[PDB]
Amino acid sequence: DEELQTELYEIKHQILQTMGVLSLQGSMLSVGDKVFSTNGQSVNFDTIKEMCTRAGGNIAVPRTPEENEAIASIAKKYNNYVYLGMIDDQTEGDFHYLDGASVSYTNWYPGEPRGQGKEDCVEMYTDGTWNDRGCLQYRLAVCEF
Amino acid sequence: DEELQTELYEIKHQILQTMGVLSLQGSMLSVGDKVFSTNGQSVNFDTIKEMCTRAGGNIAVPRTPEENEAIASIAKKYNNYVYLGMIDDQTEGDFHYLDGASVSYTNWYPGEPRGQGKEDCVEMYTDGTWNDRGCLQYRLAVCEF
Amino acid sequence: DEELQTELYEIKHQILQTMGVLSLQGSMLSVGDKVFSTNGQSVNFDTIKEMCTRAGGNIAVPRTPEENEAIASIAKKYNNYVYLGMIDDQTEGDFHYLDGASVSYTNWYPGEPRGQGKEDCVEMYTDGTWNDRGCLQYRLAVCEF
Ligand SMILES: [Ca+2]
Ligand SMILES: [Ca+2]
Ligand SMILES: [Ca+2]
Ligand SMILES: [Ca+2]
Ligand SMILES: [Ca+2]
Ligand SMILES: [Ca+2]
Ligand SMILES: [Ca+2]
Ligand SMILES: [Ca+2]
Ligand SMILES: [Ca+2]
């Protein structure tokens, strides 16, 4: 159509308007094709996971420096550590994303991970570096869509 | 096109991102094809109606158990009763949606409706059950889009 | 397709749902094809400009009476003057939009603009009328998308 193309413009325009409003007001962060957001709650790993999937997203996990920095700023903003979408329950010391694939990008705080098999989750410090941790602490719920 | 299909993916993806953010942050509830939301205001029936249409939606009305429960949770959350998008002004005892069609799904509190012709509106209790009421009370404004 | 048309309906519907939620909750104002929004911050001209572009929009500028009134209501709501997307730095007394084009619609407060070359920005009073001003004051950041 010709009508299809102007309908698409309008749709794309309106999308960027809503994204713009949410962005301007700090409701979320856009990094490439990824949108990060938090409900401000501090809960444990399993709770965060459910909150995120209930909203149609997933517990956030950084796969690039820019994505890592985005999540870091939210952690900084809320002054709380953040549980990341990765665990090493399956095999010890081998952290994997929740789809089962092995993590590639890492930003471990020097010396980490250590403490080992008692600590199967990953938390992000407010400077963006990571620490392996037990999964029952109260951490800021950050989701990716 | 081939380009059309990847443009559509992207558009659909971005939509679900904005919906995800609004959902995660409690700005609205998605139930099937219906989105519920409130501005937190307690006003009378006529005012709610205007607020909702000004936003491009309508005063909420539940047509299923799940929809009813969704509105109920908002009522619970704000600890206030909710005016529903239905009245019986036309014929007495015959409640109709605002398009004029007769209500099908009901969730009357036992004994309701009673009091009759002096009470042409419907309010939802915080447990989700309904009570027929005068239309001039201050009730939580919940809209559907 | 036939499938394309029902996919488009759904997409358009969901867009209006998110816009409806943002609108109902006062997160933004829709005027024709333009969406206005604020982050509530009072900062100077250069800062507002950056905030708006970071969100994928621009510092707001009214080109119609309705658009002017929309921005005015936000100014009223936040009880603060608003920097508008226009300056007269290039040539003195000749105010232009930030794309360089000359402003057409104006709503100067009677007597304005005056003070002249020391005042290259434009602020909106809470009644919607304009005043030319220095660019270093703290004003409400209102963006258009
Ligand atoms: Ca272990
Ligand atoms: Ca471990
Ligand atoms: Ca550790
Ligand atoms: Ca009656
Ligand atoms: Ca009645
Ligand atoms: Ca009654
Ligand atoms: Ca000058
Ligand atoms: Ca000047
Ligand atoms: Ca002046």
Cis bond before residue C113 (omega within 30° of 0) = yes
Cβ count within 10 A of residue C90: 11
Nearest-angstrom CA–CA distance, C5 and B36: 25
Contacts of C1 in chain B (CB under 8 A): none
For chain C, which chains pass the contact test of at least 3 CB pairs under 8 Å?
A, B
Contacts of C20 in chain A (CB under 8 A): none
CA dihedral C98, C104, C108, C110 (to 10 degrees): 150
**In this complex, is the C-beta atom of C21 within 8 Å of any C-beta atom belonging to chain A?**
no
Contacts of B39 in chain C (CB under 8 A): 24-26
Is residue A59 within a helix (H) or strand (E), and if so which, with residue range? Answer: strand A58-59
**Measured between CB atoms, which of B33, B37, B51 is closest to C21?**
B37
Q: Taking CB atoms and an 8 Å limit, are C12 and A16 in contact across chains? A: no
Q: Decide: helix, strand or coil at residue B39.
A: strand
Which domain covers residue C42, as residue numbers?
1-145
User: What CATH number is associated with residue B102?
Assistant: 3.10.100.10
For this entry, resolution in Å reads 2.3
Residue C104's nearest CA partner among C64, C59, C58, C57 is C64
Q: Taking CB atoms and an 8 Å limit, are C11 and A11 in contact across chains? A: yes
User: Which residues neighbour ligand 5 (ion) by CB within 5 Å?
Assistant: B 88, 119-120
**In this complex, is the C-beta atom of B64 within 8 Å of any C-beta atom belonging to chain A?**
no
Residue A43's nearest CA partner among A137, A129, A142, A145 is A137
Q: Taking CB atoms and an 8 Å limit, are A56 and B7 in contact across chains? A: no
Nearest C-alpha in A relative to C52 = A24
Nearest-angstrom CA–CA distance, C83 and C49: 10
Nearest C-alpha in C relative to B26 = C21
- CA torsion sign, C31 to C37 to C40 to C46? negative
Cβ count within 10 A of residue B136: 10
Cis bond before residue B65 (omega within 30° of 0) = no
Taking CB atoms and an 8 Å cut-off, how many pairs form between chains A and C?
A: 52
How close C131 gets to chain A, by Cα (Å)? Answer: 26
- List, in sequence order, every residue forming a beta bridge with C104; answer none if it has no partner: none
**In this complex, is the C-beta atom of B31 within 8 Å of any C-beta atom belonging to chain C?**
no
Q: Which of B6, B8, B24, B30 is most worth mutating to test chain A (most A CB atoms within 10 A of its CB)?
A: B24
Count CA atoms within 13 Å of residue C95 on its CB side: 24
| Domain count of the fold of chain A | 1
Query: Quick one: which ligand is closest to B111's CA?
Result: 6
Alpha carbon of C28 to ligand 4 centroid (Å): 38
Alpha carbon of C75 to ligand 8 centroid (Å): 22
Q: Dihedrals φ, ψ of B72, to 5°?
A: -60, -40
**In this complex, is the C-beta atom of A6 within 8 Å of any C-beta atom belonging to chain C?**
no
Cis bond before residue A110 (omega within 30° of 0) = no
Tokens of A13: 């325009």
Nearest-angstrom CA–CA distance, C34 and B76: 36
> What residue spans of chain A are helical by DSSP H?
3-24, 45-54, 65-78
**Contact yes or no for B130/B84 (Cβ under 8 A):** yes
**Contact yes or no for C141/C47 (Cβ under 8 A):** yes
The full DSSP string for chain C is: --HHHHHHHHHHHHHHHHHHHHHHTTS-EEETTEEEEEEEEEE-HHHHHHHHHHTTSEE----SHHHHHHHHHHHHHHTS-EEEEEE--SSTT--EETTSPBP-S--BPTT-S-SGGG--EEEE-TTS-EEEE-S-S-EEEEEE-
- Dmax (CA) for chain C in angstroms is 62
**In this complex, is the C-beta atom of C25 within 8 Å of any C-beta atom belonging to chain B?**
yes
**In this complex, is the C-beta atom of B143 within 8 Å of any C-beta atom belonging to chain C?**
yes
**Contact yes or no for A108/A130 (Cβ under 8 A):** yes
**Measured between CB atoms, which of A12, A55, A56 is closest to B11?**
A12
**Contact yes or no for A40/A78 (Cβ under 8 A):** yes
